[PDB]
Amino acid sequence: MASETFEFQAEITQLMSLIINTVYSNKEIFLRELISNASDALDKIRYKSLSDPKQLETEPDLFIRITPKPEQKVLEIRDSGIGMTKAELINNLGTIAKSGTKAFMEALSAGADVSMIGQFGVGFYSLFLVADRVQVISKSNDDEQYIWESNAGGSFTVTLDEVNERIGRGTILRLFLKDDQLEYLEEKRIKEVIKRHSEFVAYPIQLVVTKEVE
Amino acid sequence: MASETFEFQAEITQLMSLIINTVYSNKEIFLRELISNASDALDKIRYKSLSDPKQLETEPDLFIRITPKPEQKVLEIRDSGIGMTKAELINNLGTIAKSGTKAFMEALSAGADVSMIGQFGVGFYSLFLVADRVQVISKSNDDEQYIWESNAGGSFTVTLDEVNERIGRGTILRLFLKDDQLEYLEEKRIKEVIKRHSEFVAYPIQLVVTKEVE
Numbered sequence A, B: 001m002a003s004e005t006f007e008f009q010a011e012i013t014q015l016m017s018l019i020i021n022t023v024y025s026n027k028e029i030f031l032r033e034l035i036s037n038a039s040d041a042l043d044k045i046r047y048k049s050l051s052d053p054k055q056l057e058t059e060p061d062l063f064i065r066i067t068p069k070p071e072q073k074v075l076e077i078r079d080s081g082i083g084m085t086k087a088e089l090i091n092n093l094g095t096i097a098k099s100g101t102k103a104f105m106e107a108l109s110a111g112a113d114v115s116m117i118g119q120f121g122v123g124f125y126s127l128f129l130v131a132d133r134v135q136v137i138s139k140s141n142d143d144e145q146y147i148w149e150s151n152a153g154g155s156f157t158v159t160l161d162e163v164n165e166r167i168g169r170g171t172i173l174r175l176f177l178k179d180d181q182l183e184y185l186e187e188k189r190i191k192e193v194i195k196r197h198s199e200f201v202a203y204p205i206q207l208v209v210t211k212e213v214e
């Protein structure tokens, strides 16, 4: 119920401000970045399960699932990967200095394509190209379900999850899309972006479509 | 977190035992019954909003939404209707003697078609034709989100909801389908049942389909 507030490491806030304000054209690369991250999480739970089979029992199916929520202007990207504990959301998503953050900003100033973000290990922050707010909902086998939330400012919140659907195991990236980026709520657009940049994915990519009967 | 246990009124337990054990053929009528109930809830919030417009602001869209969850063997029927308080789930779904329950059982003994269940005002209990367990998740503007749960036995539970997605307003009927009734997880089957028995519905009926990309 009670939210804990944490400060972002200085260089991460600069990077987030850069990306949320950019007039850069090829904004669709955010999906490639989030599918790769999702695929890495799925590799980690699969690799871990080789010597610990019981790790998969909290969520036996290994998948990536994309759910547009047009009514809320939300796009969700779920995976049944390793997930993150409260301590892993705090360290990995904001407080610890990520190797590559300042160097990616340096490559960007020199002329690099924002598309290179994933080679610097900070591809997660590409979501701010299309979203002005994000909730990272995660369930690790080692902890309770938690919500990490950011709006590209200097601080983020972490809250024990008592409001969202139960994840058996994994992470949900809940993107609150910008008014000009509502095209990523469309099935044809989503399918087009997936086929173009995520051809070699070892896990099924599912698209959740809502349709009116007759 | 803590579940409260309540006893069913004697005649409701008889009716539920009757329906969960029946070898009756036309089991698909359960959907017609749940769509009518959903449509009545939607009428009640719409009628109430005529003199109280602010009632619709917790969930402005009026819809019926069917979500098969094949992995869990679950079928969900959501509406953004009036919803029920903790006291309304306890009174309306089990403790208060429903007018028509014993008379429907009397009509059934005499030879009536189970399809008549809705004319006796107890159509909700037709869900036990296809499910051996049910969770009624409901959010009224007047109360918190609660979970009513039954497996056709003599008692039901009511629990404050800290585990499911937030309903803005309305009810979710979460059916845990029987091993022989997993056909109602299929889009073609669901669409066929809706077109045959629910032609005159004033609200959009949405079907949530999950599909693997490429």
Ligand SMILES: CN1CCC/C=C\CCCC(=O)Cc2c(Cl)c(O)cc(O)c2C1=O
Residues within 6 Å of the ligand: A034, A037, A038, A040, A041, A042, A079, A081, A082, A083, A084, A092, A093, A124, A138, A170, A171, A173
């Ligand atoms: C991949 N992991 C585990 C964390 C692995 C360790 C360090 C990297 C931290 C950043 C992430 O990659 C977190 C994450 C994101 Cl952003 C995602 O979009 C989907 C996921 O499923 C995860 C995740 O739960």
Ligand SMILES: CN1CCC/C=C\CCCC(=O)Cc2c(Cl)c(O)cc(O)c2C1=O
Residues within 6 Å of the ligand: B034, B037, B038, B040, B041, B042, B079, B081, B082, B083, B084, B092, B093, B124, B138, B170, B171, B173
């Ligand atoms: C219609 N109401 C309000 C309760 C109205 C008063 C008395 C009747 C009680 C039984 C119901 O009909 C409850 C209900 C069911 Cl079972 C349903 O499948 C969908 C709904 O949305 C509701 C609901 O929330």
